[PDB]
Amino acid sequence: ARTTPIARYRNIGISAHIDAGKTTTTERILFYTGVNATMDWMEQEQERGITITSAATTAFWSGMAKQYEPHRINIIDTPGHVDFTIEVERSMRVLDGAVMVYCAVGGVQPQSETVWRQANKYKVPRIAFVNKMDRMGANFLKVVNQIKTRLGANPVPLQLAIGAEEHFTGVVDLVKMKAINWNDADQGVTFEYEDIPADMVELANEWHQNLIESAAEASEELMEKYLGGEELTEAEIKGALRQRVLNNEIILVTCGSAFKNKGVQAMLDAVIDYLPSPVDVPAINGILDDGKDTPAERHASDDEPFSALAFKIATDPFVGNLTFFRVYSGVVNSGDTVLNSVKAARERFGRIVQMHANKREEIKEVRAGDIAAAIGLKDVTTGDTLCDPDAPIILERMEFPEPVISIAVEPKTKADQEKMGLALGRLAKEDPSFRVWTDEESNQTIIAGMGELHLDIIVDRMKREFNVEANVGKPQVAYRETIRQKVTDVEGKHAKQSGGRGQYGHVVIDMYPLEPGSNPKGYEFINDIKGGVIPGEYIPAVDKGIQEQLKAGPLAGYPVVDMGIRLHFGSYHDVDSSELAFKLAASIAFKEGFKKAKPVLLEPIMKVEVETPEENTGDVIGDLSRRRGMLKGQESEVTGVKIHAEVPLSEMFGYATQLRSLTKGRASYTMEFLKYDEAPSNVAQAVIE
Amino acid sequence: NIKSAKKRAIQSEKARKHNASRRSMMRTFIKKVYAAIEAGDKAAAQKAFNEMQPIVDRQAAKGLIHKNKAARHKANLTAQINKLA
Amino acid sequence: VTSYIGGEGHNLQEHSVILIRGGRVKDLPGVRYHTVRGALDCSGVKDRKQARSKYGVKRPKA
Amino acid sequence: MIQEQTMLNVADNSGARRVMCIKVLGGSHRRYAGVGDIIKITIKEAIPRGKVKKGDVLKAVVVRTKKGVRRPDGSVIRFDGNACVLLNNNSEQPIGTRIFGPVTRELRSEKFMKIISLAPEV
RNA sequence: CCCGCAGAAGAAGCACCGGCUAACUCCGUGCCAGCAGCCGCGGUAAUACGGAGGGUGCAAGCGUUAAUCGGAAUUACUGGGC
RNA sequence: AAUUGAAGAGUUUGAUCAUGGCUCAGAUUGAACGCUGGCGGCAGGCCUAACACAUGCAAGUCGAACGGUAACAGGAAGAAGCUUGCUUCUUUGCUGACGAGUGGCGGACGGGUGAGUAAUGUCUGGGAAACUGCCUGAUGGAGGGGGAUAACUACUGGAAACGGUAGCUAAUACCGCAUAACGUCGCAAGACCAAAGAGGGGGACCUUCGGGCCUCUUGCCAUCGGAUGUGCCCAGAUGGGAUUAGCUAGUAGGUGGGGUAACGGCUCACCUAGGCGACGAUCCCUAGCUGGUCUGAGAGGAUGACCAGCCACACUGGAACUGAGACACGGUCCAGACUCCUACGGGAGGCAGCAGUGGGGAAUAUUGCACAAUGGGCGCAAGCCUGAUGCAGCCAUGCCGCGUG
Numbered sequence A: 001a002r003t004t005p006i007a008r009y010r011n012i013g014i015s016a017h018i019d020a021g022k023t024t025t026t027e028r029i030l031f032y033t034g035v036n037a038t039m040d041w042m043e044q045e046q047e048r049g050i051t052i053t054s055a056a057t058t059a060f061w062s063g064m065a066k067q068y069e070p071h072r073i074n075i076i077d078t079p080g081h082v083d084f085t086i087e088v089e090r091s092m093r094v095l096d097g098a099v100m101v102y103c104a105v106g107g108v109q110p111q112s113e114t115v116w117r118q119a120n121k122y123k124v125p126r127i128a129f130v131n132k133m134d135r136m137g138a139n140f141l142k143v144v145n146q147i148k149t150r151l152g153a154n155p156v157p158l159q160l161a162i163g164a165e166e167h168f169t170g171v172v173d174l175v176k177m178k179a180i181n182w183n184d185a186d187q188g189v190t191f192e193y194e195d196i197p198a199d200m201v202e203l204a205n206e207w208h209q210n211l212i213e214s215a216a217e218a219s220e221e222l223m224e225k226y227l228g229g230e231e232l233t234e235a236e237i238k239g240a241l242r243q244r245v246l247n248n249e250i251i252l253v254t255c256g257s258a259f260k261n262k263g264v265q266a267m268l269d270a271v272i273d274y275l276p277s278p279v280d281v282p283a284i285n286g287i288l289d290d291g292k293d294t295p296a297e298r299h300a301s302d303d304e305p306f307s308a309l310a311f312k313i314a315t316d317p318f319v320g321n322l323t324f325f326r327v328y329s330g331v332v333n334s335g336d337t338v339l340n341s342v343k344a345a346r347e348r349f350g351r352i353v354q355m356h357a358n359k360r361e362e363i364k365e366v367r368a369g370d371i372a373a374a375i376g377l378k379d380v381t382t383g384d385t386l387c388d389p390d391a392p393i394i395l396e397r398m399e400f401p402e403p404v405i406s407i408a409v410e411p412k413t414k415a416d417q418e419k420m421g422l423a424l425g426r427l428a429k430e431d432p433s434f435r436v437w438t439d440e441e442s443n444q445t446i447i448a449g450m451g452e453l454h455l456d457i458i459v460d461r462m463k464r465e466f467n468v469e470a471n472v473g474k475p476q477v478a479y480r481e482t483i484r485q486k487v488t489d490v491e492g493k494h495a496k497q498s499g500g501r502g503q504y505g506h507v508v509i510d511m512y513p514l515e516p517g518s519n520p521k522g523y524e525f526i527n528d529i530k531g532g533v534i535p536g537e538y539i540p541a542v543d544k545g546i547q548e549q550l551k552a553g554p555l556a557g558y559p560v561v562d563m564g565i566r567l568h569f570g571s572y573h574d575v576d577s578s579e580l581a582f583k584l585a586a587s588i589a590f591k592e593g594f595k596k597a598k599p600v601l602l603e604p605i606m607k608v609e610v611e612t613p614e615e616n617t618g619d620v621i622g623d624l625s626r627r628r629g630m631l632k633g634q635e636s637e638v639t640g641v642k643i644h645a646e647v648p649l650s651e652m653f654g655y656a657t658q659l660r661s662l663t664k665g666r667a668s669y670t671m672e673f674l675k676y677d678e679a680p681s682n683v684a685q686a687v688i689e
Numbered sequence B: 001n002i003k004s005a006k007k008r009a010i011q012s013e014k015a016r017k018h019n020a021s022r023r024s025m026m027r028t029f030i031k032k033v034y035a036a037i038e039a040g041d042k043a044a045a046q047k048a049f050n051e052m053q054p055i056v057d058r059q060a061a062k063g064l065i066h067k068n069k070a071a072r073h074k075a076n077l078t079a080q081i082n083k084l085a
Numbered sequence C: 001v002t003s004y005i006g007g008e009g010h011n012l013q014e015h016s017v018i019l020i021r022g023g024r025v026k027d028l029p030g031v032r033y034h035t036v037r038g039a040l041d042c043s044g045v046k047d048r049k050q051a052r053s054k055y056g057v058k059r060p061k062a
Numbered sequence D: 001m002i003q004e005q006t007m008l009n010v011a012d013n014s015g016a017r018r019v020m021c022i023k024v025l026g027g028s029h030r031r032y033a034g035v036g037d038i039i040k041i042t043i044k045e046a047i048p049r050g051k052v053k054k055g056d057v058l059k060a061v062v063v064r065t066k067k068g069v070r071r072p073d074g075s076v077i078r079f080d081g082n083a084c085v086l087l088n089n090n091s092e093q094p095i096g097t098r099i100f101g102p103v104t105r106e107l108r109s110e111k112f113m114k115i116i117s118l119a120p121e122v
Numbered sequence E: 001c002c003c004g005c006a007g008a009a010g011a012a013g014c015a016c017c018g019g020c021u022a023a024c025u026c027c028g029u030g031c032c033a034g035c036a037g038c039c040g041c042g043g044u045a046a047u048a049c050g051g052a053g054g055g056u057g058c059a060a061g062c063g064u065u066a067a068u069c070g071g072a073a074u075u076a077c078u079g080g081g082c
Numbered sequence F: 001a002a003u004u005g006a007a008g009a010g011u012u013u014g015a016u017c018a019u020g021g022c023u024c025a026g027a028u029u030g031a032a033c034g035c036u037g038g039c040g041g042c043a044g045g046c047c048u049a050a051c052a053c054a055u056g057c058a059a060g061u062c063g064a065a066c067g068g069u070a071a072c073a074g075g076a077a078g079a080a081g082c083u084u085g086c087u088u089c090u091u092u093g094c095u096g097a098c099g100a101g102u103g104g105c106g107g108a109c110g111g112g113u114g115a116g117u118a119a120u121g122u123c124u125g126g127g128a129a130a131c132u133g134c135c136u137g138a139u140g141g142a143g144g145g146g147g148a149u150a151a152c153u154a155c156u157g158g159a160a161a162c163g164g165u166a167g168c169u170a171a172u173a174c175c176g177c178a179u180a181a182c183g184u185c186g187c188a189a190g191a192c193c194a195a196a197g198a199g200g201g202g203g204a205c206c207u208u209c210g211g212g213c214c215u216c217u218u219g220c221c222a223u224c225g226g227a228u229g230u231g232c233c234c235a236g237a238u239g240g241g242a243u244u245a246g247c248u249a250g251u252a253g254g255u256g257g258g259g260u261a262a263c264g265g266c267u268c269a270c271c272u273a274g275g276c277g278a279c280g281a282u283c284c285c286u287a288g289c290u291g292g293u294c295u296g297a298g299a300g301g302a303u304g305a306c307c308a309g310c311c312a313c314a315c316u317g318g319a320a321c322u323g324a325g326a327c328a329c330g331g332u333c334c335a336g337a338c339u340c341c342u343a344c345g346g347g348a349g350g351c352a353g354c355a356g357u358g359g360g361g362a363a364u365a366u367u368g369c370a371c372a373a374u375g376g377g378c379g380c381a382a383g384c385c386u387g388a389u390g391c392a393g394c395c396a397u398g399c400c401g402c403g404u405g
């Protein structure tokens, strides 16, 4: 129909290291915005007391001083942790601003590093909030300095703390140069906007004067007057730094103590002050359908053709499938029939809901620059584009973190087996960073996720939401078998003088080993037969014969690999010999030859590439060695150090978990199959079926 | 249940209570007549019979007994009050 | 019950979800059903062109 | 007073019906359980539908004992029967979702709160 | 529903082609890979497998499966037998 | 004129004839799946879990029955910031109207479902012992009194759902009394039974100047008819099984009390010793029936979605009350299973109404629009209510046109 505010939209996401307060502070907002509802409402996430899934609400900030024309803010509180990073890839692709939280005590810390990289990956503007200023060991400026050093970024303290830890009373707006006083009860609200105290005047008389100079560096004519010692107006500084915040060249820092209520509020102001509108933002990239590029563009316009991206999929018990989206362009009304471009199927919008702090309010229309959940949409997975069917476009689609941990699961009670297939399937489409498949060999169900905890609460989600408990183990291994010695002329024979068809077979051969040559074969059959000792028509079966035993060798089943066999001698009856008769002799020929060929158990090795900080390339190297692993290089890739190693599969299980422990959480790795090598004796004799 | 035609329930309760005491009384007079019949006291029977007739007859009109019951009662009681009394 | 998997090549393994069609095989006694290619986890036949409706193979982009 | 052996009536749905005590938890040589202590259980009865089944082994809170309970001043509450509520072996916490018969204010623990919210008395 | 306006423009698939059964060839493959309602095709010139060209049949549907009756006078009263 | 319409083929053998199974060509579908997909018209759309259900809606309506004012309007037992006949505060139920309350009618219709029911039902055909709101034809009544009560008011309890004491009030609420036949009982003589008022307008005459009074429209009581609806009785027909052959104590009949609107072991006491069954009782298994639908030349077989008739059921088991009608889908009570709210003392609820979710499944739709038409509830009416209904949304599911030249 009409709509109301528009362009005064603030799409921000809060994210940070664990604890930090990146959810306490989110609830605090809701209180202040909501003058006149915990974001950890998952059962599992209340028991454990940690954000597991990103929680979205919207609320209206009138500005703490009454100062502002009321703005509509779309907030998204996200996980700290890792394991569920996907909940930040998405929770950062889509929205416009970002409030990076930091613990007054715990500095940057490893998972601050990760969410930072993710902000850059999507070039999202940002400010900063140093929480917990009331805690033992608090040091505002230290963290400020760390943002610069540890994240190699450009911080600009937009503020200053009034004391620290148990003596933390308020803050200094070092723009309007006053020491905001939050009071006793009413938690926040009020002010008395008090002036700087005598204590901090000298420090306060900085601003980081390279604030006004970092405001200066906005535009030269904005500093030309600064050069002439012309004190710039309060209004043109806010515009200046914002200009540069909006250009990711600078990060304003704010600080506070959500627990003590002395701070959250100034930060909200700082959101509208310096964080983007949906229009102060690059229009979207993308493609056309079959055709080619052109960025879809789609300017942030109510009067453009509708286009939105689907992030995050859920299922509420009472209203069904929820499908969250960010409308970049155009508009959808309740009943419009939009297009899923990346599936080439159309969907019909029906009900629409905005999670509204503490009430699922219903809506009939959804404009650009807003987010919401569409009820009932049939086949919409995460990353899909929902555009106008007449003006069709694929959008960029964030990235899918790709799992680091794998595990075999069996359904405890044989009945549940069916139910597992279902539930693992459901949890899969919800969470693209989780994966499930069935081992093409050794048919066991295998799940894989971004970590120990990740898998934990997946499994935990099976029990809770599908009443499927299943226990867990280390995956089985696909071993192989071969021989070591080239064995000379071994004799396989048949002779069936019984009661009907004669059936006689005689074959003499050499079973010699091979090297990992020719991709398809791994098996070489030579017809070095004499003049015609065996007719060329019974020569296809002896080959076929041998083919049969290669499927599960005599050591412990398992495929037989890298084998060569030569024909030399044989014999037949002018009739009694046969298709079968030599095929069996070959079978007998394979045995005995195999017994006498010194058989050995092969195991699969991986080409392993670890990417790690320079600080502990020793520990990692060492662990690789400890895992019976072979090393082959180190590159020294820019900032980390790519470490190359060949290490056996049956030993890399749960690698991710310890690599994490060894490297403070900063260390990718990757693997794929490389070859089959001899298993150490202790291994071999153990692998016994 | 949350439909104001629940006042219907509260009304019909008043109704039962009304019908309760009247139909109680009516019966206790029909009781009295048989008391004579059983006692043998031929006079007391007509005394009460003629005492209950107005009750029973009225109650048929009031519609808490409806016609032929009132008919039947005094009908066969007549047929008994003078079978020795 | 046991069911045929017609067509050249297939996926299908231990925990696949499939769709049974009914239809016997005069060569496999006790096999009295077909698997319906291209429904649920059962992929269609690779590169098949004639009779793709069976074997669940979509029209090769004309 | 419950002790090993001893049949309890079960005071929830869950399907248990008649349940025997196979241990009294809470100490070496602890003799009796009562009041609202916890005990290890074996299912002797069980319903056809049932959450739990015959031969299952769980825990349970004694909620009603025929020897009863004191409270200060000196009073005494006795119940005719012996009753418990089946608890999951790992997290305590009622496995049922309804309570039957009275319970006593002693059960006013953090972890037994769910019990007294259900339950139609004391 | 009527009248204006632009421009062939926005709009063709599915099954089948050894006999019953309307419609035939080459090529690949070689009792393999596979087909199959029924009989039966495949072990080197395959009109039967897979592709192609060609053809027949239906057509915004076409196939397949599931299902009832028919064909079945094969529960026979009509209308069968030992 | 009008149910006037019957096709065979493949396959046993070296070959043949016969027998006989299997198989195919036809039609049909509340379908599904695979590949493909332009429109429209009319129609169809949970066949499985009668499985559980968030949320909204599906039953109201009369101030022309009554006391009434909280809100909304105008008018004000009439007034300001002054903006002197345009206002927005404060008062007045005056009038329109109307929250809550008493009362009345409806909620027993409409709509859903197929669980139960092999005959407590259904179909065809008969029958005698019954009641029947609203609508109706006819005859007369409509006199005079009486005791109460919600609301309300003063205290007072709860987290809530709900209320608790005390006091007052209206009526078409309620109860006597009078009246009392073509009514009930009775052979008769005789006994005995009811009810209510409310509105619109108005000459005089009269007035506590409220009205009386006149008139007109409605409503109330009674009885006999009518109409429609329902209850009850009998006969024949309405699946499979005998690897179910015996069944039966209120059982079968009689008498007399009681009972119901009514006939009746419907009930109770006593007395007879019966009653049913191979023309299938009993007991098991399955099932809602019919009009009809599909197939078939017919006879048959198959079937009971959509439309209409009939029955049954309303979370499960059971029960009555109110009432013309229920043993009540959106009523009450009790028990159960389950779920939900709680400030832990206690409370609440039943989508097989419409839409919608979860679940099951190969599989079946939108949390749309409007009472404008038709029709139902109340109302004098205007009107209000109406998820019946009329339309629209979704799906090639079908039938029929048409196109894609």
Ligand SMILES: Nc1nc2c(ncn2[C@@H]2O[C@H](COP(=O)(O)OP(=O)(O)CP(=O)(O)O)[C@@H](O)[C@H]2O)c(=O)[nH]1
Residues within 6 Å of the ligand: A016, A017, A018, A019, A020, A021, A022, A023, A024, A025, A049, A050, A051, A052, A078, A079, A080, A081, A131, A132, A133, A134, A135, A256, A257, A258, A259, A260
């Ligand atoms: N002492 C103190 N504690 C604080 C402050 N702010 C937050 N906390 C505490 O940090 C703890 C965790 O807060 P939380 O909001 O859950 O952080 P989080 O970002 O959601 C952790 P996750 O990464 O799982 O989402 C809480 O106990 C909270 O009280 C503070 O200002 N002072």
Ligand SMILES: [Mg+2]
Residues within 6 Å of the ligand: none
């Ligand atoms: Mg499903």
Ligand SMILES: [Mg+2]
Residues within 6 Å of the ligand: none
């Ligand atoms: Mg009655």
Ligand SMILES: [Mg+2]
Residues within 6 Å of the ligand: E023
């Ligand atoms: Mg031909």
Ligand SMILES: [Mg+2]
Residues within 6 Å of the ligand: E045, E046
């Ligand atoms: Mg060839």
Ligand SMILES: [Mg+2]
Residues within 6 Å of the ligand: none
């Ligand atoms: Mg071919």
Ligand SMILES: [Mg+2]
Residues within 6 Å of the ligand: E072
């Ligand atoms: Mg026939």
Ligand SMILES: [Mg+2]
Residues within 6 Å of the ligand: E080
């Ligand atoms: Mg015969």
Ligand SMILES: [Mg+2]
Residues within 6 Å of the ligand: none
């Ligand atoms: Mg009213």
Ligand SMILES: [Mg+2]
Residues within 6 Å of the ligand: F115
């Ligand atoms: Mg049934």
Ligand SMILES: [Mg+2]
Residues within 6 Å of the ligand: none
């Ligand atoms: Mg009288």
Ligand SMILES: [Mg+2]
Residues within 6 Å of the ligand: none
């Ligand atoms: Mg009698």
Ligand SMILES: [Mg+2]
Residues within 6 Å of the ligand: B076
């Ligand atoms: Mg009698």
Ligand SMILES: [Mg+2]
Residues within 6 Å of the ligand: F300
């Ligand atoms: Mg026949």
Ligand SMILES: [Mg+2]
Residues within 6 Å of the ligand: none
């Ligand atoms: Mg019932």
Ligand SMILES: [Mg+2]
Residues within 6 Å of the ligand: F329, F330
């Ligand atoms: Mg209901």
